[PDB]
Amino acid sequence: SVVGSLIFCLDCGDLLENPNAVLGSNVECSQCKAIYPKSQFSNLKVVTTTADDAFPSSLRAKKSVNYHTLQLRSADEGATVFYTCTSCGYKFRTN
Amino acid sequence: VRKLLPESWGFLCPVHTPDGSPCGLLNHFAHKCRISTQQSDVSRIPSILYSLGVAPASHTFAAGPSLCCVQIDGKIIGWVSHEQGKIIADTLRYWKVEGKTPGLPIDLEIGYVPPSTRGQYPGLYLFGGHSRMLRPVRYLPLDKEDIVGPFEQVYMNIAVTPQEIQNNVHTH
Amino acid sequence: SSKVNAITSQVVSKCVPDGTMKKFPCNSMQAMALSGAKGSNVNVSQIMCLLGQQALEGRRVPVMVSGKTLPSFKPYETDAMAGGYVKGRFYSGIKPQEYYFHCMAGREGLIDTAVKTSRSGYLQRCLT
Amino acid sequence: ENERNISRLWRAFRTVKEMVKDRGYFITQEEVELPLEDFKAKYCDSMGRPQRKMMSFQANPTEESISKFPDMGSLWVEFCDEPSVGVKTMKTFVIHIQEKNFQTGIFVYQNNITPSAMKLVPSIPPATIETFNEAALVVNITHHELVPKHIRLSSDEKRELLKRYRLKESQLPRIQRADPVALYLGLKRGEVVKIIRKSETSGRYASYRICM
Amino acid sequence: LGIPRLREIVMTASAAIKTPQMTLPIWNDVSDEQADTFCKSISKVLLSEVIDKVIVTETTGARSYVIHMRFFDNNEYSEEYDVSKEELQNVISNQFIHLLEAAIVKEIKKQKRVEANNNMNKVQRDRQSAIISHHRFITKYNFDDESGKWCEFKLELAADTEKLLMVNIVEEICRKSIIRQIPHIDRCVHPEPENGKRVLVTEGVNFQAMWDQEAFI
Amino acid sequence: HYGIQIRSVRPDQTSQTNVLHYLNDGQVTFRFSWRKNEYLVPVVMILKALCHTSDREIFDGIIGNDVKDSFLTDRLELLLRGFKKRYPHLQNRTQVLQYLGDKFRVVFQASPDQSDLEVGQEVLDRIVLVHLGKDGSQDKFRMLLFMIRKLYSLVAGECSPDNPDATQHQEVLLGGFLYGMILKEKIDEYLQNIIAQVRMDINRGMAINFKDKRYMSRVLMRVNENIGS
DNA sequence: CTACCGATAAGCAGATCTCTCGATTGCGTAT
DNA sequence: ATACGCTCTCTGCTTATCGGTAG
RNA sequence: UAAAUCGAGAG
Ligand SMILES: [Zn+2]
Fold first, then answer.
1. From the candidates E56, E108, E161, E162, which should be mutated to test the interface with F, based on the most F CB atoms within 10 A?
2. B13 in Cβ contact with B111 (< 8 Å)
3. CATH class label, B38-129
4. CB of C107 within 8 A of CB of B17?
5. Residue B19: which residues within 8 A CB-CB, separation 6 or more?
6. Quick one: signal sequence residues (chain F)?
7. Gap from A15 CA to chain E (nearest CA, Å)
């Protein structure tokens, strides 16, 4: 029920309240109003690295330096080749 | 906004445009560009899409550019990977040009946006509605006539003449 | 653009007036281009040697999202012609891709011509 | 780093002497062409920290200046050792100007002059008082390439100018009383500055700007 | 360049010129090796130009934050911008944290509607205590005083506060935090000499600061 | 400056434009226009009004298998908690729909007999993603989830912004379709005119009988039926 | 503690060559 | 047949309000 | 005899 930094009710799925904004040792759902103990929800740890693009600079850039084969149906079946030779114009397919 | 663009190849005439105030704004169609005027029968397409490998969106549990969203006329139909999305896009083109399957109209525009690094949002889109801009190109397999649109065109390679065809990179 | 312009300059240096079939003063095109009656050296170069690189607002031909400069060019094609380098000349005609790029350049020229006249009257009015 | 402050003060003192000499008072080139070590010996104590009380000096009009401008009087140049100017310093400076009867005294401060102190600058006519920041005098503006030669005209030459072109005082081109060159020369509203302007088409030619 | 420039000069008399520039002559004494480095001693350096990345570790239940800042190698930015560890660390201690805390407090006010070594030496503890005392809600601080390639510090907020982005805030502050800058000047260049004279071209206008450098200009 | 604009068309070839704005505060705003002025609504309201949804259903429909993506998780947490903070009473679909119908009753010229729930459903069916039409509430919900994910992908710098000037993203108003839609608007105006006539009859006259053919033919002659002009 | 001097954030105004044709010009009650 | 009420600006100036001085 | 607005053009 715990993903990221938010906790979802296991009965209905409404977003639960922020634990540190409720009286201790009990979390109550907003709609179905089930019983949720504040235990076992110890760490809402979320890490967030920057965009790796928010800091454009000069030193930043220095760490970055006729026949057709077609797949028709699915990845299992082999590729089918369609030839159309310019010598005569005769076109044909091959598997 | 007045610039001539490579996307208008075959739809807007590069030459026919008044000189002066209306330059770039008032332009004309290419002489073989037929504008769609009636909805194509896109009723059977979701069924054949499911057979190809599309996973129906009703019970999929998927989202994001990491998967290929398969949509029709502005309605999500399924979620299949980018590789299989390209496979089914080419399959749909082949079946639509080879006018055997009844569920695929010849005017079905197949806009496939493959994954790219910070490019356009990927996914498979199918259009069959009114007012679309369509032009006839020659599908090189089967050596037949295909109809393409501006959205569908900017990702596939159409040789301007058969003498300039290259292997494995040109399909029209 | 610099490299393709260097190639263009080499072609023009080699192929005129040495490569011309008719020479000045008999060649009236060169006769009226050298004397200043009408035209320039770049005009006869385009007529007789090549059109050269087509410049869109100082850059080359615009690129689509897919990386194609045109439907007939593979994505990110490392070609001078793909970027807008016309090797053809008005004597022997130009290819459809070169035709499209030249149309882009001519349209940009007309747009600039229209927008330049409107951009200068107010300065003279204020000064006067 | 204190050497940088010493050098800046030396440059400011040199430019102040150049300004006084240009204004028409007698300053010999020995004072202007003062070597840095000579300045340190003459104005820096054992610790090397300069004292700005000894830098204050007095100047008198030259013979030519008295011949041309008979109304000129003694000039008193003051430096403020205090890092700021308050009511106490400004009023004391004004009284020091008055008690010695100086016709003009120019004030050089360090950081800023308190607005309560700024009220006493126009307090005492006719002896005007001028305010100059030390950091604004590190480089003499009139030595710049673009600035021309400005020479304040005497009353007789002003009469001759306004008679030759048949002008009112106002029809002349105007130079702002607060622009740097007018503060440099010490222009009081009404008098004209002749400008020897080097032209691209005519070489030297003379313009005239009245200060208003 | 062109008619718009005329529009700036004649029509508007813009004191706020769109692209101000300043030309500086060069004494024949100085050499191009000194010239290339002098233009780097005046050009502005934002704090963001040296940060490789920023990692925000938010653990709520009082809110906690580990605002780790990963820099480029010291040999890299100590050469590209001539910025040493001491100057960068002082800018972070004095300028960056103040702006960050001000922005956080402002946002809350408007919304009311490889492992680093744990052990520290004697002086670092006192510096941490001083930084905690001078700022509002910092409970930890450390700088890589030996290598200058990271900076980790804590940030405690009231447990009642709701979620903040805490990455856009750091992104905005870092681009506006300044290591070194001469006022109204953002960059100095050393273009090729034209018509013989050697000239430095700067993208800002501050005569008073250029008056100091008699040695070079 | 980010956003997701969509132009949907009903079967009769008339268009409604829906614009999803992204606010630096963290909330996304649905924007439309009814007669000649714009209206704005937090998109969580419309998401819950379209069909019976939990709060984790939206989380799963927006955040896919990428549970470990911090950007998307933080933005969606901000959005959901903002909706909870601003509207703490709205808990089920019908209540949200009733609130929406109460908010949009005067502008839509809703009849006095319309329940707030049904007028809210009508406002939904007339505004948000009309190209799915009625009975497509599930499809409208999926489309909105896709559009929100696309907006978040754009603001994260993982997608190029589509160029409206490029012909790749354009269509043609044929003129005949414009003729049809302007004629439809004129017919709608005609119906409104006859209703306004019988309204001015209610407040002034007395010989009024809705079941009388005579009254119908009498009040029909009082309007301007010359649509062709 | 309170009144004067500024110092920005926000709102508001006007504005960005000549010449030739054709076509239209409103409705909504009340009497 | 007929008369009277009506949704992608550049440059400033000008206003409102926020801090600091010193009175 | 007039005026706007729209539209089309010329240099
Ligand atoms: Zn619940």
1. E162
2. no
3. alpha beta
4. yes
5. C110, C114
6. none
7. 14
